[model samples]
Target: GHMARTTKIEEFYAQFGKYILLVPGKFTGTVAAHDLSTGRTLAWLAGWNYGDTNPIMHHMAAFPSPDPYKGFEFIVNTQGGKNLFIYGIPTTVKEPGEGFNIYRVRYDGTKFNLVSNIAEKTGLGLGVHVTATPDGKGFAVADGQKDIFAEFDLATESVRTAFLVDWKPNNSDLKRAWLEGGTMTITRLKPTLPGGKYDYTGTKGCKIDWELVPGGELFLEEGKVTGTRQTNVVALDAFVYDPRGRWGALSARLPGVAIIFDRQDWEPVVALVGAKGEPSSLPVKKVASDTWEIKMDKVVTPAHQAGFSPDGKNFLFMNGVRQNNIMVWDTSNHADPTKWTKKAVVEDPGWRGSYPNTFHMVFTPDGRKVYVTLWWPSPTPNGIAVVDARNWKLLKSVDIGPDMHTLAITYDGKYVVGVFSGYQKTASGIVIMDTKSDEVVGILPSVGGHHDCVIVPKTVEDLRCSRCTTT
Candidate 1:
């Protein structure tokens, strides 16, 4: 796309002028707001409380409200409190679980404002993804390095339930969790945090009773909660609740598999996608109602991120390394895991010619196409890959810029905004493509390197959702 690209978007401006792009600058501590029509960065939504850790703004979600005062808010996860991401690794963090923050940016239509805090709290660490419940009354956060899943009651602004994902709390682990309450002598095994939901500012390595949060109360019930993923380090990079909010999916990096759980009970619906890689492995074992295990050694696909199709009828699990491919799951009969089938596997074509990282992906509003980010910073590379959603085919890869990763489609589904974090290394730029043609409009060096993009004040009318019917 050249000067003519600009010509096409010029006419689009009249139609898109009313929209805006909220880009999360991961290293900048701010989300750059760019006008949809002009590509002008109007303002920044910053989380000042993050201090020197730079907020590490990674993901943002539209937070609509039933409360009139705060009618609309956008949430961003800092993934702050640590800085070991040198090799472009998304989920590597310092031990002992430090960071806990989710920035709430409000738009009163008077001007955008930031409400800095998630201490939304204690157990929430290294949160990389935020998904708003359909009613926007609750939020599900995927605590990245913490290997934990934290849910928040938006109305109360507190952790509704927090639990270590795939925790197999064995005899000793259970004894310690219940007897000592949540702390483990194991430094890296700080899954429940020092004070559960209390700010650990002054506590500092002090012994505290693990208060029974809503999720892990079983720990004290005569050693109820048992088992963890493994004895070693485990990180979760990706997570999402199904559009209907009845189910949730998370991808564990170390243990390496995509897990399915019932949102109703917060219990895993199925377990162990083995070397056989079959979704028919249903009614799997649950150590208890609150605990589950993964046949870790039998993992085959090693998916690192999970996304559900807009209709909630399909699931996509991405494996960035070890074996790079996108596994699509037919989720029509989500209740019976045996009926859920692995529909197709879209292998990264870049794998053979050049190293490519499947960092992020998002389905179009209609669920007809899926756009993926292939982070290979070559002089010129196919940075974004488009897929045929219905057929599960890797249609093509188009390079709009270096380090392409995150994406967000506009309310009208006219444009798909992509964030490329390769500008100043500390900053990022955005690539705009016309969704009608699925071609580049142009790349704008609007801000520093960002991890995600979102449009503001998402309404039921314009919101892109998975529960809706699609082709």
Candidate 2:
């Protein structure tokens, strides 16, 4: 008496459908997206505007609510503006709110809609790195001044208190000044946020004071204080890596030592592993007054980014010298300081520049390649250069007209994305690059300034393994 129940396969498959694609930008940004098979571009993913004057979104991201909303794509300008373009799954975002902006337009297979824009409440600052948690639940950002860290929530569209390090003596003073070889320390908060409240609640008064040695060199000394401390350590830079957990590495200004911190503790205690020796007052013997001749001080004065290998056994650094130099440090053994030695140092003449504090670099996902950009010293027009990590060689150099700010690699590591800060007059948009071929592939134009771009990869079950597949 009852008719046979009938259900179409397409209807059942609609419950779990998505497609993956790679997107690149004009400046230095790229991302991967997995949209619902709704024939609509479920997510506009990202809008990265490096040259536009208006506030537009440019970049790429994931699709669907749980997955796409996990981490949204955005364009940060050198002048401190963060614009985002999010992917909508259940519903399509027709228009951004007031003060919001858009960059590129794409057909979501169903209807053509403009994706990517800055929210009305998003803060303004020189945003550099845009990173989200692997689960796409939380995210963090670092400013270009290298002083403040911003945390955000995509689901609630909420931003938390600005976390500033007590390293600086005063706000006017360079709290975290740019150095040639020294390093910076960044700690991620545990339980990120509890009870719907977000605040910096750890050992509050942490210090990273520097002192002037006999030869005008610098050293880092830590104590419990709210202001800057003077250590005999000169030229130092620090980078934190959370490959699986909260761990970090600190490199001396030039090439003296590489320190590793394997935990999120605020004190210098957790564990100490140095590249040269114990974290003590061991003077850097002067071989020659000029660093260029000795290949330590003058050779790698303006070092930029540092990261650990996939296995976390080796360290890679992008040092600014006659040409930009890429140095790899072996950190397999932390007990014997001398066990760590420089494995490779390749000078890239294609990235030659005399800028004092305007060069930055990033390594590919697998640690097989390095990407660097040369900027105008006064914070103006910037140049682009790509390097090969395997041999530490120069791969390609492209002269982006002018006014570029920050760049980023996609979560998959296949593409390199950038944002060109065209200031107020010129339009800004996203820049896409084929990292594998080291070529500028496409550009999404708009009107706005550009800063940083982070990547969100596709995910499934145990097959959650991600790769940097680029064309």
Candidate 3:
């Protein structure tokens, strides 16, 4: 044989340079990582029990590489067995079983091995979304199906049934929650038990709590103790906490309610809007050193999603259904909700479609631009809405031609990566758009139906390409 031709892949292909993008597909249950700069596949984790027979991968969360505990990531998969129904309508989907599973894997940019797999039958329900603690020491899972939240301890790699929220079929309910800094905000809904069963008439609505230790083990010794119940608010659907853990915004499912909270003590500062689409505020009273109460308010238009700007100076609220507008509030005085003002109410008729919903969103690293994902109906351009943070004006809509579900801004703030979940199959996979030109620069195809994307820093040592070697 002629002298074997030798070419280093590193010389031909750059290593994981600046950043890495993690994408988890919901429909196919696949998780993948891509080199942000070169648009090359760095690593991939195939969906469990993959094929036409398995469940979808709903969401995932990552931990820092070279982590003290171990280099690993978490994924949640939901299995819908045959004869599933919504409001008595047949979905006609079949699976090996009905339930959900939480999985852990190594983050070595190579084939991942399952570290832990907790199924729904274990009283953990279906793990829909996951939120990591700031320090990457632990994480929490939101199970909409079982109406409970599960926590994972990194030290011992054990999972615990942390909190159980109530769930209701067709009413204002809690589907998910968020954890940041040291505060955990869980929305309201009826509670459920081990076998995917629910207690419909029990308790309903949202509550806030303060976990004294960041990512600490919350052991339940027959109800010996738990986090302090901070506040009981209205039936809120979606909410977000400010980066600093000082404030939060709670949005309701129906026509009239939004509350801003003083996260420091889990107190409702004021109501942003009432049920009639008008400005409003709720009365808050101190109940104790760590608890407070807010006067109940009427449900307003579906405040589907709401978040605070990076600087915590502005709040953006998007409606779920029966509305086609986005509201921006001046939250510079977030502590004193009375001083909060409705800065802008920008309308976009196109935002309302068959689904007519908005989900994942983010403020640019510099806090100058805001991008909101729009889930439009058929025949409409489904994409992202770019807004000028300074004036809260709708600059324009960048049509990604598919249901854009989740998004992430590159660490350097040069580009935006969006996941076109392929809801309509018009366009699938991830697309990287240049922030300056607003044009697509790269694409990672065949990602299947995806739900979330995260961009994190990476270095050459993180690359594990077969043809390359690094020290």
lDDT of model number 3: 0.49
Global lDDT of each model? 0.55, 0.38, 0.49
**Model 1 spans > 4 angstroms off:** 1-12, 15-17, 48-53, 65-71, 84-99, 120-123, 166-231, 272-284, 348-350, 377-382, 423-427, 461-471
Judged by lDDT against the true structure, how good is candidate 2?
0.38
Tens-place lDDT digits, model 3, residues 1-471? 586886544532242235667777765557777765465676676754543244456566555555312234544444343212211234464434443556665664455566655542234434345544334455555533233444456555444323333212222222211110111233322225545433321111112221111001111111222322322122233334444445545444332345555534544566666322556455545555443444332333445455666666776676555455677777787447778777777666665542445556766767787777777645565777788878777787767766667677665567777787655245687777777776666556755667666654232112111000000
Model 3 poorest 10 in a row by lDDT: 462-471
- How well does each candidate superpose onto the true structure, as a TM-score? 0.76, 0.49, 0.67
Candidate 2 Cα misplacement greater than 4 A, ranges: 1-130, 133-239, 242-246, 249-260, 264-303, 309-314, 317-324, 331-341, 350-352, 356-366, 377-381, 409-414, 423-427, 460-471
Best by lDDT: 1
RMSD of 2: 14.2
Of the candidates shown, which would achieve the greatest TM-score relative to the real structure? 1
Local error of candidate 1 at residue 434 (angstroms): 1.6
